[PDB]
Amino acid sequence: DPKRLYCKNGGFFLRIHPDGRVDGVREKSDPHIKLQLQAEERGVVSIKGVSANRYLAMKEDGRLLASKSVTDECFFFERLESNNYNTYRSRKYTSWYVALKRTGQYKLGSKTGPGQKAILFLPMSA
Amino acid sequence: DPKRLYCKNGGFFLRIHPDGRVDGVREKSDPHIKLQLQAEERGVVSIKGVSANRYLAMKEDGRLLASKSVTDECFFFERLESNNYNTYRSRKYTSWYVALKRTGQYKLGSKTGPGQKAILFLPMSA
Amino acid sequence: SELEKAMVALIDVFHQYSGREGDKHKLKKSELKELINNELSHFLEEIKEQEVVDKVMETLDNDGDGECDFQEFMAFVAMVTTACHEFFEHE
Amino acid sequence: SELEKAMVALIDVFHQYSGREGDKHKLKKSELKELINNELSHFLEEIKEQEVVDKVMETLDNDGDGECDFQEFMAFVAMVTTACHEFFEHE
């Protein structure tokens, strides 16, 4: 049930912190990398951190954080790329995608685009 | 001056022990692998262990040991092979050569012969 | 043989690319990336943000000086081949 | 590219030789020797008493179970290439 969003950019898993911060880690021992993908519409899912109790949301500036309340920015389009990876685009911002930097830090949505490596996620079972 | 006979068979250095035993070791930290090559005739040398004070000798049975006295079995023919290695044949036994086994133990002269790997030694400076 | 011919090529390519550094026996990081972007670019069509580069430099520098060698050179080929392939399934 | 074509060959050869073990993803020591005595026999014309074999098996089995893999497979090629070459000058 719990899925770990493995990014093909550096090899980091999306880690949601209970404080609201989101980053990427390589260790599979971290219990904050266990996320649950709730579906709202066909192709639209919401990423919620199991051991965080917060939902992934993107701000109108490009920042990525975890909200405690479900907002319109907590919904992302679940798309399958031709490389067998999952691309997540915000429903509020159809021009911004979710991405993780090779440095382990999250990537600004305002700096995302098709063709990048940081935008390629793989939901691995936990 | 001191030379370490590096065998191309396993990568072991000829180690002469003060007790009279001879074997091969990979550790260059051993002071018993420092041998001195004393020339008696053009192409005929005697191998003496510096920190052993014993000369390398081959018995009529094929065993290899270290003698405290210079005997006719302590003289070996120093020949340079086409592979840039040194072959040592006993002057007393023109059908036996000096060799080290890949297991670390010495090879019986009665079991030597051209084409083997154990008969290829390289006098590396110490 | 197969590996036999591969050796002739690998040895030449190694020296060829190591020449970019200044001599012809070691690589200075940049040459490693050059290899990936020129020889393995047909296989590994990713890189860009430097993902595999971060992992290979962690296993290549076995000496601890940033100096490449024949020993890690071939291991580098293995690393880039397996890492990108197994990138589809991590622990 | 050079390494590109080499990969295609190395990958196939790896699976081919690993097939002797039973599966096609690992070697069982004997296959490693088979590689040296068939693919690298044109370069390394020594072996016989098994000298390089003793050394490669000390670096190949990184897992600690005697199981070969693509990671050590290419490292194996490096090991046999450098070991026999540098055998003319040790420390």
From Swiss-Prot, chains A, B:
Expressed in granulosa and cumulus cells. Expressed in hepatocellular carcinoma cells, but not in non-cancerous liver tissue. Phosphorylation at Tyr-55 regulates FGF2 unconventional secretion. Heparin binds at N9. Belongs to the heparin-binding growth factors family. The record marks K101, R102, K107 as: Important for interaction with integrin. It is found in: Secreted; Nucleus. This is Fibroblast growth factor 2. Changing K107E: Reduces binding to integrin ITGAV:ITGB3 and suppresses FGF2 signaling with reduced ERK1/2 activation and reduced ability to induce DNA synthesis, cell migration and angiogenesis. Acts as a potent antagonist of FGF2-mediated angiogenesis. Monomer. Homodimer. Interacts with FGFR1, FGFR2, FGFR3 and FGFR4. Affinity between fibroblast growth factors (FGFs) and their receptors is increased by heparan sulfate glycosaminoglycans that function as coreceptors. Interacts with CSPG4, FGFBP1 and TEC. Found in a complex with FGFBP1, FGF1 and FGF2. Interacts with FGFBP3. Interacts with integrin ITGAV:ITGB3; the interaction is required for FGF2 signaling. Interacts with SNORC (via the extracellular domain). Interacts with glypican GPC3. It comes from Homo sapiens (Human). Changing K28E: No effect on integrin binding. This protein binds heparin more strongly than does aFGF. Acts as a ligand for FGFR1, FGFR2, FGFR3 and FGFR4. Also acts as an integrin ligand which is required for FGF2 signaling. Binds to integrin ITGAV:ITGB3. Plays an important role in the regulation of cell survival, cell division, cell differentiation and cell migration. Functions as a potent mitogen in vitro. Can induce angiogenesis. Mediates phosphorylation of ERK1/2 and thereby promotes retinal lens fiber differentiation. There is a cross-link at K68 (Glycyl lysine isopeptide (Lys-Gly) (interchain with G-Cter in SUMO1)). The modification Phosphotyrosine is found at Y55. A motif (Cell attachment site) lies at residues 19-21, 61-63. Residues 101-117 are annotated as: Heparin-binding.
UniProtKB/Swiss-Prot annotation, chains C, D:
One of its GO terms (cellular component) is cytosol. Keywords: Acetylation, Calcium, Cell adhesion, Cytoplasm, Metal-binding, Nucleus, Repeat, Secreted, Zinc. Its main location: cytoplasm. GO terms for biological process: adaptive thermogenesis; astrocyte differentiation; axonogenesis; cell adhesion; cellular response to hypoxia; central nervous system development; learning or memory; long-term synaptic potentiation. It comes from the Eukaryota. Although predominant among the water-soluble brain proteins, S100 is also found in a variety of other tissues. The modification N-acetylserine is found at S1. Ca(2+) 1 binds at S18, E21, D23, K26, E31. Residues 12-47, 48-83 form the EF-hand domain. The keyword Transport does not apply. The modification Blocked amino end (Ser) is found at S1. GO terms for molecular function: calcium ion binding; calcium-dependent protein binding; identical protein binding; protein homodimerization activity; RAGE receptor binding; S100 protein binding; tau protein binding; zinc ion binding. PANTHER family: PROTEIN S100-A1-RELATED (PTHR11639:SF134), S100 CALCIUM-BINDING PROTEIN (PTHR11639). Small zinc- and- and calcium-binding protein that is highly expressed in astrocytes and constitutes one of the most abundant soluble proteins in brain. Weakly binds calcium but binds zinc very tightly-distinct binding sites with different affinities exist for both ions on each monomer. Physiological concentrations of potassium ion antagonize the binding of both divalent cations, especially affecting high-affinity calcium-binding sites. Acts as a neurotrophic factor that promotes astrocytosis and axonal proliferation. This is Protein S100-B. It comes from Homo sapiens.
